[PDB]
């Protein structure tokens, strides 16, 4: 039992959260962009 266990474990718990929030937003991001580009293909196709 040293304070180092929980100390240097806490500063990893924070990295695990950060990647969680990142790759949540970087996933939805893809889908929103992919929804736009799909409906452009549906306009491009539809008028032609």
């Amino acid at each position: 039992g040293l304070i180092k266990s929980l100390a240097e474990k806490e500063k990893q718990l924070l990295e695990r959260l950060e990647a969680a929030k990142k790759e949540a937003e970087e996933r939805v991001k893809r889908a929103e962009a992919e929804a736009k580009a799909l409906l452009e293909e549906a306009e491009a196709k539809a008028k032609a």
């Binding site: 039992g1 304070i3 929980l6 806490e10 924070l14």
Partner: protein, 100 residues
């Protein structure tokens, strides 16, 4: 005279409680501003230290951290516990008669 009273009260508290807060702060350095871990400061005398440890250990299993560091006489002790294990931790101090 008002300045003087404030200056004198501040000294009186600071003269008393600098050495414990130094000790306590040191023990869990950089982990008192974290949400992941909860800290609770409290004072124990040599006499009380074994009782407090037993009480906490049964209450809080072996996933609690009891640390102490001296100061010349008793020990200011810090128990460090997980967040949401706060009530349980407190309850254990309260049964011994020790408080925050």
């Amino acid at each position: 005279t008002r300045q003087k009273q404030e200056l004198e009260e501040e000294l009186a508290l600071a003269q008393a409680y600098l050495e414990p807060l130094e000790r306590l702060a040191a023990l869990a350095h950089g982990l008192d501003k974290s949400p992941f871990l909860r800290v609770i400061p409290f004072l124990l005398t040599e006499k009380e230290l074994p009782l407090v440890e037993e009480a906490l250990r049964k209450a809080l299993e072996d996933r609690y951290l009891l640390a102490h560091e001296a100061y010349a006489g008793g020990v200011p002790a810090l128990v460090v516990v997980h967040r949401k294990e706060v009530d349980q931790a407190k309850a254990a101090l309260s049964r011994a008669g020790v408080a925050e």
